[PDB]
Amino acid sequence: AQNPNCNIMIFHPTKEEFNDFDKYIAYMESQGAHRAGLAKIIPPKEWKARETYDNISEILIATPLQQVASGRAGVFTQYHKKKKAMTVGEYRHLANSKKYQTPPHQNFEDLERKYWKNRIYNSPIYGADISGSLFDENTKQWNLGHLGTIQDLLEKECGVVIEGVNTPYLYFGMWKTTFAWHTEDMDLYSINYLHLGEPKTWYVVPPEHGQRLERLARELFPGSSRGCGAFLRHKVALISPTVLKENGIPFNRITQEAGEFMVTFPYGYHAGFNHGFNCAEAINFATPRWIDYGKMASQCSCGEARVTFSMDAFVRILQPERYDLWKRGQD
């Protein structure tokens, strides 16, 4: 069995290997990459996403989100307070202001220490989930707006034709902006490209050990767990590496830098934070190996998780017994 310790693997495809996206995902899995829940892919030196980022300041962040924490430094939830619209140029200036800018630090490890010590005492503002793309239309390799769709994968594997679409999303971050512990909708894959700016640190639990994280989360967030049998789908809970280690939860960590891709694998729980002003693009995708995870994915039916239009068909076809309850939670 490849990668039995479930380490995060880093890949350096050649320009030739970068042509066929599906084939390369399958290659990484042949080497055991999925066992970690997360892999890094460094593009060949010949590749670029677009020519320059000199022209992005006019993108609008219609609903910036202030991420307000509650709890203790290592075990907390966050809620999102909506703020007035601003441009990417305005948001960049805000990220670089004395109130929000990255503190002086020695290295990524010192900054990680500072994040976990101090995160709860600040409320950083995140531009999340903005439909759009920064890949040039002429970029043919690993262009996240030109991937094969999840609807087409489901049709190819299962024969059924369904409604829905699958487009990318932009994320604008600042110091301490946080992504809570989660798997993807329907335990899909994700791919994330860091277009520009400061790094993103990731934490991940191997898929084979995801239920260990769920059981700890129920213990640590006991009111939330009574409210909903899949409350991690709410995407509000944070648990630090120190607390994970105290409780024996297997996990790994890695820092993504500008120009790098990360792939999350089905049922790979992940969380993390941004080091400073940055911009990422991400989208969900599927392969044949996903279908069994989609059929078994948990679902939130309490009303909180609320998701895209396109998840309806996935539930309806893969999880018909759960469909009526889940759709009530949508309505």
Ligand X SMILES: O=C(O)CNC(=O)C(=O)O
Residue 161 CB, shortest distance to ligand X, in Å, is 27
* CA–CA separation, 5 and 177 (whole Å): 30
- The residue among 149, 186, 155, 183 whose CA lies nearest residue 314 is 186
Q: Compare residues 209 and 233 and give the one whose CB is closer to Ni ion.
A: 233
Give yes or no for a contact between 272 and 296, defined as CB atoms under 8 angstroms apart. no
CA distances from 250 to 40, 234, 238, 272, 291 (A): 19, 22, 16, 16, 25
Residue with Cβ nearer Ni ion (190 or 274): 190
Give start and end residues of each alpha helix (H) in 96-177. 108-118, 150-158
DSSP run (H or E) holding 210: helix 210-220
Asked if 171 interacts with ligand X (CB under 6 A), we say yes
Residue 58 binds what, of Zn ion, Mg ion, ligand X, none (CB under 5 to 8 Å, by partner type)?
Mg ion
Cβ at position 160, least distance to Zn ion in Å: 27
Give whole-number Cα distances, 48 to 7, 134, 190, in Å.
Answer: 28, 11, 20
The mark string for 189-218 relative to Ni ion (x by CB under 5 A, - otherwise) is: -x----------------------------
Nearer to Ni ion, 143 or 190 (CB): 190
250-269 footprint of ligand X as x/- string (CB under 6 A) = --------------x-----
Residue 54 in contact with Mg ion, rule: CB under 5 A: no
- For residue 280, the partner it binds in Ni ion, ligand X, Mg ion, none, with Cβ less than 5 to 8 A by kind, is ligand X
Burial state string for 265-303 with b = 16 or more CB within 10 A and e = fewer than 16: bbbbbbbbbbbbbbbbbbbbbbbeebeebbeebbbbbee
Residues 184-203 that bind ligand X (CB under 6 A): 190, 192
Q: Is 234 annotated as a binding residue?
A: yes
Decide: is 302 part of the binding site for Zn ion (CB under 5 A).
yes
Q: Which of 69, 282, 297, 315 binds ligand X (CB under 6 A)?
A: 282
| 169 marked among binding-site residues | no
Cβ-based nearer residue to Mg ion, 92 or 176? 92
Q: Are 267 and 207 in contact (CB under 8 A)?
A: yes
Residue 91 near which of ligand X, Ni ion, Mg ion, none (CB within 5-8 Å, type-dependent): none
Smaller CB separation from ligand X, 6 or 128: 128
| Nearest residue to 245 (alpha-carbon basis) of 273, 219, 223, 212 | 212
Query: Is 179 a binder of ligand X (CB under 6 A)?
Result: yes
In the block, which residue shows the tokens 């767990």?
A: 225
* DSSP labels, 25-91: HHHHHHTTGGGGSEEEEPPPTT--S-S-STT-TT-EESS-EEEEEEEETTEEEEEEEE---EEHHHH
Does 58 participate in binding Mg ion (rule CB under 5 A)? yes
Minimal distance, residue 70 CB to Zn ion, in Å: 18
Nearest to 67 by CA among 103, 112, 24, 100: 100
46 annotated to bind ligand: no
Number of residues that bind Ni ion (CB under 5 A): 1
Task: Name the one residue in this structure whose structure tokens are 């994280």.
Answer: 213
Binding site for ligand X (CB under 6 A): 171, 179, 190, 192, 264, 270, 280, 282
Binding site for Ni ion (CB under 5 A): 190
Binding site for Mg ion (CB under 5 A): 56, 58
Binding site residue list for Fe cation:
182, 184, 270
